[PDB]
Amino acid sequence: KTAFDTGRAALGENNVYASRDPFDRPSADARYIAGGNAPAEVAGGSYLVDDGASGSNGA
Amino acid sequence: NLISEQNVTVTMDLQPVLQLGMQGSETVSFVFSQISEYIGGLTQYGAVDLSVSSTVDWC
């Protein structure tokens, strides 16, 4: 989420999760886009039907 | 009135015939493979056609 910083100032705020076997769920301190290693996640649904919000504004 | 008689015994067996026939497959399979299949749901029209015959009043 954090913005693209300039120069050697951030060093890790945007770098991709590097792995040699990406088909296992990443560790608890890796980077998720929506969710986490622990059961901290988002409920199942679709970007088509509205439950609250819909379309692009949804999760 | 002298007579000579021969007797036959008639035994009527009124069995309670109830007959429910069907014109569909025994197995009705719902295979939810698509997302719209989940969201809109699955509907199968005319899966079973019941034809009824009965000697007695039936429910």
Side-chain angles (χ1 to χ4, degrees):
Chain A
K1 183 46 167 32
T2 59
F4 274 140
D5 314 297
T6 177
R8 162 218 55 84
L11 264 290
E13 289 65 338
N14 286 316
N15 296 83
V16 196
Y17 162 62
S19 86
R20 94 178 57 72
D21 55 338
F23 279 1
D24 63 54
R25 69 173 65 263
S27 167
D29 67 83
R31 278 175 134 120
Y32 284 70
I33 273 186
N37 181 38
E41 80 294 19
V42 294
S46 165
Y47 73 110
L48 274 162
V49 190
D50 48 338
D51 303 328
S54 176
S56 169
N57 269 327
Chain B
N1 296 132
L2 319 167
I3 59 155
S4 187
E5 58 165 79
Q6 296 263 321
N7 321 292
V8 283
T9 310
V10 181
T11 312
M12 187 185 28
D13 173 316
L14 270 182
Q15 259 151 30
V17 183
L18 300 152
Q19 195 184 282
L20 179 86
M22 104 199 297
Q23 282 140 60
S25 64
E26 279 109 341
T27 298
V28 168
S29 76
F30 288 84
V31 178
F32 294 78
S33 45
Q34 302 284 80
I35 274 279
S36 87
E37 281 215 40
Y38 264 73
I39 271 181
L42 259 281
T43 298
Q44 288 180 16
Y45 286 110
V48 297
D49 289 345
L50 298 160
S51 63
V52 182
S53 306
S54 163
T55 303
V56 295
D57 301 358
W58 48 280
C59 311

